[PDB]
Amino acid sequence: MNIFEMLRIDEGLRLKIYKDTEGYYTIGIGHLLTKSPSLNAAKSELDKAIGRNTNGVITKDEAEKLFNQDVDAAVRGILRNAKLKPVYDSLDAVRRAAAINMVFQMGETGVAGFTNSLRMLQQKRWDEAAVNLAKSRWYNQTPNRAKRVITTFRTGTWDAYKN
Numbered sequence: 001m002n003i004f005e006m007l008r009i010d011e012g013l014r015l016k017i018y019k020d021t022e023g024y025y026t027i028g029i030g031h032l033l034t035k036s037p038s039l040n041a042a043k044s045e046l047d048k049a050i051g052r053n054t055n056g057v058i059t060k061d062e063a064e065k066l067f068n069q070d071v072d073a074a075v076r077g078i079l080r081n082a083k084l085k086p087v088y089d090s091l092d093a094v095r096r097a098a099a100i101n102m103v104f105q106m107g108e109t110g111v112a113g114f115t116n117s118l119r120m121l122q123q124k125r126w127d128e129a130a131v132n133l134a135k136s137r138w139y140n141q142t143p144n145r146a147k148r149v150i151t152t153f154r155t156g157t158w159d160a161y162k163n
């Protein structure tokens, strides 16, 4: 298990434009296209991202290319953020994957808002952090995924992604 496999499990793979859990146009492995309700706007974003005139459909290789870029962007974003970087630096590699997962799902600004959770994670108060993380819109709206990510933060193992 690693961050790519983890996010592939959590996000799935779809080669045609679909709506994500929030109703937003997305493609590939959780590549958000736009928050606009316009499918035409989403298609335009897709074409720009891929570099060709699509039919709203991409190949697996194209989906994986966007995914690579998106994981890289999530990490980059953490490292550029004054609130997130010190917590990320404090974590082991498994828990770092949980952090990347959250930023991939909700963005750098969104995760940086988990101030109290972040402090508990830096303090390595794992059970307390887990409880705090669950007191969130995130957990309520995507509880199964959040439970997997939280278990990863709680235990520093991949147990929630095995079997």
Ligand SMILES: CCc1ccccc1
Pocket: 078, 084, 085, 087, 088, 098, 099, 100, 102, 103, 111, 114, 117, 118, 121
């Ligand atoms: C709240 C989890 C986290 C920790 C460090 C960096 C980003 C995200």
